[PDB]
Design a protein around this ligand. Sequence first.
Ligand SMILES: *[C@@H]1O[C@H](CO)[C@@H](O)[C@H](O)[C@H]1NC(C)=O
Ligand SMILES: [Ca+2]
Ligand SMILES: [Ca+2]
Ligand SMILES: [Cl-]
Ligand SMILES: [Cl-]
Length: 530
Amino acid sequence: PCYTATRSECKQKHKFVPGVWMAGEGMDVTTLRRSGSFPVNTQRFLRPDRTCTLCKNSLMRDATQRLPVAITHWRPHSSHCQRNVAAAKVHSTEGVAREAAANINNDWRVGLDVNRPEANMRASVAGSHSKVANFAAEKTYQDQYNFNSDTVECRMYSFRLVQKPPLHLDFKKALRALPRNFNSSTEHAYHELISSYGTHFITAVDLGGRISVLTALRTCQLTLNGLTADEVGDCLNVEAQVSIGAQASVSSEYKACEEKKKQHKMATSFHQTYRERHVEVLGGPLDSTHDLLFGNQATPEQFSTWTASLPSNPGLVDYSLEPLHTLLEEQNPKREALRQAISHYIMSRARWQNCSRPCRSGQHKSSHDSCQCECQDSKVTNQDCCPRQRGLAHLVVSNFRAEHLWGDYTTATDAYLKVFFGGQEFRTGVVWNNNNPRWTDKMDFENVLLSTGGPLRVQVWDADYGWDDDLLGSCDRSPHSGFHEVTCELNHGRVKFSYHAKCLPHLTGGTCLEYAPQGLLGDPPGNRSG
Ligand SMILES: *[C@@H]1O[C@H](CO)[C@@H](O)[C@H](O)[C@H]1NC(C)=O
Ligand SMILES: [Ca+2]
Ligand SMILES: [Ca+2]
Ligand SMILES: [Cl-]
Ligand SMILES: [Cl-]
């Protein structure tokens, strides 16, 4: 809808097409954040012969708007934005970076060395240091998380740069103040140009609006409450669709969510219950930029208002990135130096999987692969090493010894012990003719319910050859988490023993009922490495 205007039409006061100055801006591919600096100058509006290009904007009541000479393919889209919440299930930080980087339409890698064999294990390069990836990494370090993404997109405009755009004088000067090649000493001079003008520059754009909400769900806390990561995730998507008006309070999907809300005795909605969210809002006024899917003021009316603001205040939805060196001429030797510099900057900032690092607290590396983490109790715990129910613990009863022990008939004691817990029974060997017997038994009760139990029963028996053995005494104890020393007083003497009841990973408290986060062993991630 753009046309070549006459010298008179060009003299007229007209605003530029919305968000046009976004094209040509530099961007750091590792963070997916605009550099603030412009290696390309798109400011020129009037052609050498004093004529220009003007566009009729159908999204702004056919307003006559100015188009810079460096901009081509200006195309406005529909004002109608389909109320559709795009849901995604992400399982790692690598996936979050991938979902963030999915907004780059082209191959940003072209002409760059973005391939080390040891530093390429499940490596995130684009969006590795993006705000959303850093959010997913911080969560990953704290506890075992599963991520749910809910997205709404409206495309308002699309435009691109010219094949040979005019370079900025500030950029041309910065290129001169650079050394001839990328040795190991010039590393700082080049990294200053990269940190200022970005690794790439935006060559094409799709402007409009985007609401992107990443919800972090503690995978093991969910399993204890009888919910799955996919169950809660699907419920959030439905709640987001209600807030934007995609579906009303009367639908098959929303009925299932209201059923699960009552079934699991929830006071408020899934979004009011699971508040560990990262929110990205692009487009609309900065004065009214907030969560429209899971916000407290999030109404279908509030979504329409935002949608209406998009034509005049558009944000960067998706784009095409080209490396900085592509701006320099092929004859110039500083191009190959910058190409190598960008390659080095991007690569040093990569985030990969170091199989040398220890597994998440409560896991261990298998003998088969150094990159494979195994659960401690495969029987009771499901996948992702989450305990199936509250109260599960590893009970080991040992250090069995009795002092000055005898019964109602004789001082000649032929003692042995019967130990009971959770339907399981263990028996020691007989210590013939001894008032102070000591047993070497280490009773592994494996995985038991510390809450249900019932009691940890220790029966002291006296072995009688032909006749029925006589019970010297019996005692009960309600086991608690940790190492405990027990002393049971009998009619003659006492029986002593100890037990360590270790809560399964993700469980804490006296009877292993409470939920506990399982963090990664080491220091928190905040810098470039694997
Ligand atoms: C710096 O670059 C120059 C290019 O002429 C090279 O001669 C020199 O060895 C480099 N310095 C290093 C690699 O420390
Ligand atoms: Ca006996
Ligand atoms: Ca007997
Ligand atoms: Cl005791
Ligand atoms: Cl013990």
